[PDB]
Each structure stands twice: as structure tokens, then as C-alpha cells.
Amino acid sequence: EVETFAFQAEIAQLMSLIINTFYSNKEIFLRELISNSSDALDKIRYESLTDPSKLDSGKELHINLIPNKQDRTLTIVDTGIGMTKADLINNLGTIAKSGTKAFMEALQAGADISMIGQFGVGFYSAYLVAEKVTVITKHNDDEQYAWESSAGGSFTVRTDTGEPMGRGTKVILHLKEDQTEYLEERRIKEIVKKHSQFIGYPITLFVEK
């Protein structure tokens, strides 16, 4: 029921560097995830311009940020195009092998970790703040699937039994114990205002309690 896969070696190396390098500017993870959501929303919008039925799975195009201090999780939900099972296995819809090699080479030449998005592998900056990441996704052409990894060289993919999503992607960040600042409303607002001013979709920061 659950399939376990090994990361390509270059991606495992990148994840180990992200988890073990000293780097204080960890807030960039949220810019990268919101950017990915915006790109996926662009994709379903473009497909809908010639086939309106592709929005039968949901006409609203938005990004929601959902902190939960009890679970110590930050969840980012979008209603973009979503990923098929094959996309998930294929490094979450990215050419991550060649992106990670170029990025780690740039880091050798003095590049900064904040440039990770220029190399198409910004997703993995989630491991700056998260000990585990779950990605739940639904694409019009496939069933709902959950990808998960705590690094350590492997990820799992399984059919998702949770709340049906309609269409889109949910990223659940299981935060490290010393990274709970990213559950505070003021901190999230600050990061969104600083890094995501020109995202062309409504970003709703949920409140708690």
C-alpha cells in the first residue's frame, strides 16, 4: 500500500547539506513554497483558457497558510494543477538531479543558500525548518496521493485516504522544535509581505484557537 523510494544520490546530498549547514536566513522556505503554488496555479489557469472543464474540480484559485501550534505544523494549501503519481516520484515535478548539481556547484563558488530557487529546487529548503514534509496532491488526471520524507535518503508515496482535495497541492511542514517562530501570525505576515508581494493569487493566513 505504501511504496518507499530512494532519492537520487545528488538530491540526498542536497537534503543533507540543507539539514546540516549553518544558515540563519531560514525564512526563504516560505517564499519558495508560495512561489511553487503560484506556478501551479498559473498552470491550471492556462489549461482552463482552452478547456474550461479543467476547473470542474474547483474554480477558486488561491493559497492558504495554516499554522497549527498544537500539532507544530505549518500547512500551505493551493488549488493549482496538482501532480500525478508519476510527477511525485519524479522529484515532485522538477528536474531536481540537474538542478541540485548546479546549485551545489554554485555554493562551492560562493553562492548563497537563498539562491536555491534559481536552480529549480527551492522545495528542498523546507528542510531548513521541517524535520518531516508531507505533500498531498490531486491532479485532474490521477487519484489523490501523499508523498512524505524525513530525509535520510528515502521518501514514500501512498494513495491518500484523507480529506478529498478536489484539485491542488497541500504541503505539511512538521516543524523542528526550535523553528516554531514560523507558526506565529506576525512572523508569517512579515515573511509574506517581504518576499511574496507580487504573487497574483490571494494568500490567506488562517488564525488559530
Ligand SMILES: CCNC(=O)c1noc(-c2cc(C(C)C)c(O)cc2O)c1-c1ccc(CN2CCOCC2)cc1
Ligand atoms: C503537472 C505539473 N504539476 C506542477 O507543476 C505542480 N503541481 O503542484 C505543484 C506544487 C509543488 C510544490 C512542491 C512540493 C514542489 C508545491 O510546494 C506547491 C505546488 O503547487 C507543482 C509544482 C510546482 C513547482 C515546481 C518547481 N518548479 C520549479 C521551477 O522549475 C519547474 C518546477 C514543481 C511542481
Ligand SMILES: [Mg+2]
Ligand atoms: Mg516556471
